[PDB]
């Protein structure tokens, strides 16, 4: 009814999640807000007076750039008065009817006023209200005097792109401290609790004191000013400054020599890898496409991985137009494209429709064509686990794999679709797999059995275990020993029965001693790890016919050990190395398994399976993605710079601020095998957590480049001069540096800049495997 004179502040915080530490902060935008009131429809005028930006961390004092710069200089000539230019809002029953302003101004300055007027649009209830953020499930929690507004930011419908994972919380408890009629204070907590960061927005609007006729309000907006045109209450995307300047001759040239192939092991090189991806996400189609027009091919796969790791509409079109799938000269670039699409945390259907069209196209390389279908099942597996199995592309891809496997005319297509169905995890492929498991061909059934090993306990029934029983027990025909042991591994792991454990232990001793040592060690590894299946084994071993030392004493070379690299009551990481040798001691199927678990859930981090016969081949798994298995021979092995996680939820804060929560995790791998044989697992985890708050006239940032190196090299120290096989297994970890970083920014388009550095060296120890292997290895020691 009258003019209300209020004071306003915009508290922006960028915490590292320690709990109480002023290491990094953001700007506070302050003004004295005059609010005047110009059915339940109403129009008000909101004016920003005494608008100035102050720091909340005044402990440093005059170290920032707020000294020597006027409030006119900080925000510019036009934007200082644009905030001081009054804005309008139509409100009906406490909700935004329509937002009116001059609109001939910058986007970000309008965002602050949009966040400023939202405090008067509030209501005990739940709805999808109209506010600065968009349309979200907003929980109204009314107290006896005040009201608590909780906003489910997961339920927010906004145009911002928001998508081995990253957990996050978006608690937006907003308190409208209201005494008599309107806001007397606002306690708007905007915590985005997601290596972690607590980016906090807050606004304090406090009322201090207070001092056009018409039946229709439609023409009153024009009557005050003709320029008061229609604009949304939701903020818009802006880029007044450089932002993601493409600068192909400038910005890419800076990271061109920081991603060279000769220093891929260094974590300093990988730090520039994640930076260039962030530029390309806010980049147009022609900008990204121009970079690859004349780039060097030697540094190109890093750029190809960087473009593919963006996963936007324009970049996907840019890489697809750049990469000619008919062209057979660029084998690696499509292969790096396929892997990064397979390693994309957010694959898209248009990519899947492209990859379906790639398979429908004329791909020159069959291995890439196999790799497309392997990735195609990986995309389907991600989509069907994301409630997208009913999609038009997915059913097209499923009928390619299922129908191609059911109706197969070529031997390579069956091996292609077996690898594809292994990634697909389709429950309807089980009758096909059990058919192929009993098909009688060695590599086909073993790949199908390991594909069946990928299936879980609800996907394996009594009939499936009975189907694999005839393979293992050999009731009807003879099978190779690797298939039977894998079938025995499935039965013991996936809820065995009392008689199933009973018959397996009785088979020990009657089998050849090469299989007997491994099969004993599998049950021995079952008992050591206190598995839930071991309780049934304990009931079988309770009788004297199974606990006898005649079966438990076996002279062999195989082993099966499982242990914890790290373990906590909340989560744990496990590893295992169950190597099965031949009768003469030659390695046959060595399963180097790397696993990670988080609470009840768990992710198969890696698996390198080295297989030999007499062929020589390896199977690579990286983070629930079965890669294309590599055969060394028959009749720089693994090398790639790739991303792991990507959480890039571009928040729109309740105060009208642009928050870009970008968390990226990448690594560079170099796995090469040389035969005395060694296998290296070089892991360089580089996590660059960024939370930048920008409003085009004040900038604040926080970067946490926590980079860690690692390495797990196994040495097969085998002495074969004597008739017994002196086989020593040893997984040696080398020393790797551990570093942390923290950067702080407070700019207004030097600044409040600081860097914190820590460094540690992690001591590496050889994995002892089991004590039986330790006796042969102590000859070396």
């Amino acid at each position: 009814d009258r003019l209300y004179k209020l004071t306003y502040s915009t508290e922006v915080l960028l915490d590292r999640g320690k709990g109480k530490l002023q290491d990094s902060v953001g700007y506070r935008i302050s003004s004295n807000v005059d609010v005047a009131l110009l059915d339940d429809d109403q129009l008000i005028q909101i004016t920003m007076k005494d608008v100035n930006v102050e720091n909340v961390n005044q402990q440093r004092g005059e170290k920032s750039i707020f000294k020597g710069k006027s409030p006119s200089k900080i925000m510019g000539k036009e934007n200082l008065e644009a905030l001081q230019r009054p804005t309008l809002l139509h409100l009906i029953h406490g909700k935004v009817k329509e937002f009116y302003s001059y609109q001939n101004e910058a986007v970000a300055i309008e965002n602050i006023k949009r966040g400023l007027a939202s405090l008067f649009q509030t209501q005990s209830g739940t709805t999808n209200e109209v506010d600065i953020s968009g349309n979200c499930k907003v929980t109204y929690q009314a107290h006896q005097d005040k009201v608590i507004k909780i906003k489910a930011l997961d339920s927010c419908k906004i145009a911002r792109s928001g998508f081995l994972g990253v957990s996050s919380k978006a608690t937006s408890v907003t308190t409208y401290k209201i005494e008599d009629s309107f806001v007397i204070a606002v306690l708007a907590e905007e915590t985005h609790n997601f290596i972690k960061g607590k980016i906090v927005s807050k606004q304090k609007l406090e009322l201090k004191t207070t001092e056009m006729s018409g039946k229709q309000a439609a023409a009153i907006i024009k009557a005050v000013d003709s320029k008061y045109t229609a604009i949304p209450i939701v903020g818009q995307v802006f880029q007044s400054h450089c932002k993601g300047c493409p600068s192909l001759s400038e910005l890419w040239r800076s990271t061109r020599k920081y991603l060279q192939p000769d220093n891929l092991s260094k974590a300093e090189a990988v730090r520039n890898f994640l930076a260039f991806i962030q530029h390309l996400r806010t980049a147009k189609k022609e900008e990204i496409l121009q970079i690859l027009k004349m780039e060097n091919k030697e540094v190109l796969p890093q750029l190809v991985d960087a473009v593919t790791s963006a996963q936007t509409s324009d970049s996907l079109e840019a890489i697809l137009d750049f990469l000619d799938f008919k062209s057979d000269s660029s084998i690696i670039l499509q292969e790096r494209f396929l892997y990064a699409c397979g390693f994309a945390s957010h694959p898209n259907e248009e990519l899947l429709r492209a990859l379906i069209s790639k398979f429908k196209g004329s791909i020159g390389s069959s291995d890439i064509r196999e790799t497309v279908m392997i990735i195609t099942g990986t995309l389907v597996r991600k989509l069907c686990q994301n409630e997208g199995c009913k999609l038009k592309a997915v059913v097209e891809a499923k009928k390619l794999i299922l129908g191609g496997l059911e109706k197969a005319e070529k031997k390579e297509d069956t091996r292609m679709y077996l690898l594809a169905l292994k990634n697909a995890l389709l429950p309807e492929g089980i009758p096909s797999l059990l058919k192929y498991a009993e098909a009688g061909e060695g590599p086909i059934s073993h790949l199908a059995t390991t594909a069946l090993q990928r299936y879980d306990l609800p996907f394996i029934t009594d009939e499936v275990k009975k189907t694999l029983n005839r393979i293992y027990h050999q009731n009807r025909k003879v099978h190779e020993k690797t298939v039977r042991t894998a079938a025995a591994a499935i039965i013991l792991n996936n809820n065995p029965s009392y008689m199933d454990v009973k018959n397996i232990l009785l088979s020990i001793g009657e089998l050849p001693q090469e299989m007997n040592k491994y099969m004993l060690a599998i049950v021995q590894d079952i008992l050591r790890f206190e598995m839930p299946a071991s309780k049934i084994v304990r009931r079988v071993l309770k009788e004297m016919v199974a606990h006898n030392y005649d079966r438990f004493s076996r002279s062999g070379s195989s082993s099966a050990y499982t242990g914890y690299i790290e373990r906590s009551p909340r989560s744990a990481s496990t590893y295992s190395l169950d190597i099965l040798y031949s009768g003469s001691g030659i390695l046959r199927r060595s399963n180097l398994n790397i696993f990670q678990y988080i609470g009840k859930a768990g992710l198969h981090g890696s698996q390198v399976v080295i297989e030999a016969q007499g062929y020589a081949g390896m199977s690579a798994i990286l983070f629930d993605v079965q890669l294309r298995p590599v055969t060394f021979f028959n009749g720089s092995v693994v090398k790639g710079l790739i991303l792991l996680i990507d959480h890039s939820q571009e928040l729109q804060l309740q105060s009208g601020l642009k928050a870009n929560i970008e968390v990226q995790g990448g690594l560079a791998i170099d796995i090469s095998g040389a035969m005395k044989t060694r296998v290296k697992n070089r892991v360089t985890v580089v996590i660059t957590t960024d939370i930048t708050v920008d409003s085009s006239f004040v900038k604040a940032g926080l970067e946490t480049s926590t980079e860690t190196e690692a390495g797990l090299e196994f040495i097969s120290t085998v002495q074969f001069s004597q008739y017994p096989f002196l086989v020593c297994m040893q997984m040696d970890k080398d020393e790797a540096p551990f570093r942390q970083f923290e950067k702080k920014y407070e700019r207004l388009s030097r600044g409040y800049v600081s860097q914190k550095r820590k460094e540690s060296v992690l001591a590496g120890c050889e994995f002892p495997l089991h004590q039986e292997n330790s006796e042969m290895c102590k000859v070396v020691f």
């Binding site: 027990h473 009731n475 009657e510 004493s553 373990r567 001591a763 590496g764 120890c765």
Partner: protein, 438 residues
Amino acid sequence: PEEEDHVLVLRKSNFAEALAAHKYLLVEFYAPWCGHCKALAPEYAKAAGKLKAEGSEIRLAKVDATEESDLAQQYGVRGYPTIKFFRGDTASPKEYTAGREADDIVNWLKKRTGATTLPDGAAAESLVESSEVAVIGFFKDVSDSAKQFLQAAEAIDDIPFGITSNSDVFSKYQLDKDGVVLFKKFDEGRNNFTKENLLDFIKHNQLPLVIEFTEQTAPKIFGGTHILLFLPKSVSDYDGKLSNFKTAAESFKGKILFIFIDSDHTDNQRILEFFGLKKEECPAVRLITLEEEMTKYKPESEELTAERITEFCHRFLEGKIKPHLMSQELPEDWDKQPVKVLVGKNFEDVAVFVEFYAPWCGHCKQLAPIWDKLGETYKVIAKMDSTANEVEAVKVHSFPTLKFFPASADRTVIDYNGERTLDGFKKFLESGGQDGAG
């Protein structure tokens, strides 16, 4: 039902049909991998052909117990060469434990249908040594107690009971009144004797004192605390050591089973290495219990003689006999070095702060000067070689998982996670374990 070489094949669809149709059917719960079933199958086919070519209703049939495990689970079949027979109304099948050949089956089924008779002019050989353990029943009237003896004879099918009515046989076997004598060929050869004491007597006297460890004897060993003896067959005074073992076995016959095993054969080296003894002591005596937990016991007196081995089973029955572990004891010069070794033997009496190192890790090799300097400065800190010894309280997947030992024996586990430096451990010990632990 499928018939192959006059053997019915049962796959859960005809087993009930065969047993309800053929009243007198021999059952076999065989396996595809077992060598016992592999040798039994031609004998099973031969016995089926012998019964089928003769005019008798009895036949033979085999069941793959691996693929038909429900029949084994319901009945309680625990062996693959197991042979059974179901007649009328539900009853336990006759436990076939005799020779698995064809004519042996032909002779064995006559006992189960409802003793053996031979002419008395067998030169006093056939009746007594028809088999390994043959019992001859002597009674002038073959009544009040004679029918009870006949019922006891028909109670056990696997024992070939004898029928005697000739007057010269009673005097030649030197019996004033009627009695039951068990005959054998290994231990004594003659053992002269409620309705169960006779069966207990026959089962006790039939049991051999000492068993050579072989494949054939092995299922009967666990079928019925096997005190072993890794005695080489070519050892010095093998006969004397075996006689001492036999005299030890005479003290404890049924409760503790005595088995002598040749350590010379390489096929027994797995049994040698299961107990941990790499032929360290040739007359070594170890007792193993296999009742749900393999606990290999350790004799109190390593100075072992006939009397010591004899009363070692009594010592085990007392319960004071401790298990055997491959944990070395306190070293000779532990007092000279400021840091001492508290081994698994001394992990309770003497184990203050404990640590579980390993000579395996090269990082421990690098930390050995650091752990030397920590002890030299703090001149109780205990390092434990858990590769050789054993940790009873907890397990160490990552071996330098430090457990800070408390005062006054209120044991707690708190994991030190320092930087593996010569100053971090000194800083940890400067607080007395209050800081840096856990």
